[PDB]
Amino acid sequence: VFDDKLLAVISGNSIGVLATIKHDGRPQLSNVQYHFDPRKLLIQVSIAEPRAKTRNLRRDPRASILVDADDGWSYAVAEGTAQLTPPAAAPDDDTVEALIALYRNIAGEHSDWDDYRQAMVTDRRVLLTLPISHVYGLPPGMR
């Protein structure tokens, strides 16, 4: 079905344009690295608490991510309500463990997990989980 075409676009990439909503209601656009989980139809991204986009999501969790197909013109957009973990506070907390799982999914096995753990805490990292509630766009064959 049509949605399968859109999900295939999301599954075939690891970068997308995240749209969050500013205090004044205007959209803010950022490019982000992500991992798509086909099991639960989720898009997971690592963000830092001090960033404007993160502050936007804290006030209004509604988010959208546009992903390009392999032709660089056709695309799919995932719409949903973001679920954020609290920022990493201690090297061994649940947020850090969740970020370790993400790193493995996106980059592979880190060389020094202790260094990674420390960095997540230092940068107040947060795991953004975006369950896809709706998808739209113009997938290959439609452009």
Ligand X SMILES: Cc1ncc(COP(=O)(O)O)c(C=O)c1O
The residues that touch ligand X, with contacts defined as CB under 6 A, are 30-31, 48, 51-53, 138
Give me the half-sphere count of Cα atoms (radius 13 Å) on the Cβ side of residue 16: 30
Shortest Å distance, C-beta 102 to ligand X: 12
33 is in an annotated binding site: yes
134 is in an annotated binding site: yes
28 is in an annotated binding site: yes
Residue with structure tokens 């936007």? 56
Q: Does 77 bind a copy of itself (CB under 8 A)?
A: yes
Shortest Å distance, C-beta 72 to a copy of itself: 8
Shortest Å distance, C-beta 66 to a copy of itself: 4
Query: Among 9, 44, 47, 75, which residue sits at the site for a copy of itself (rule: CB under 8 A)?
Result: 75
Which of ligand X, a copy of itself, none is residue 48 near (CB under 5 to 8 Å by kind)? ligand X
85 is in an annotated binding site: no
Instruction: Report long-range pairs for 51-57 (Cβ below 8 Å, ≥24 apart).
Output: 52/22, 52/28, 53/18, 53/20, 53/28, 54/84, 54/126, 54/128, 56/20, 56/21, 56/22, 56/23, 56/28, 57/20, 57/82, 57/84, 57/128
**Cα 42 from chain centroid (whole Å):** 9
Binding positions:
28, 33, 46, 52-56, 73-75, 134
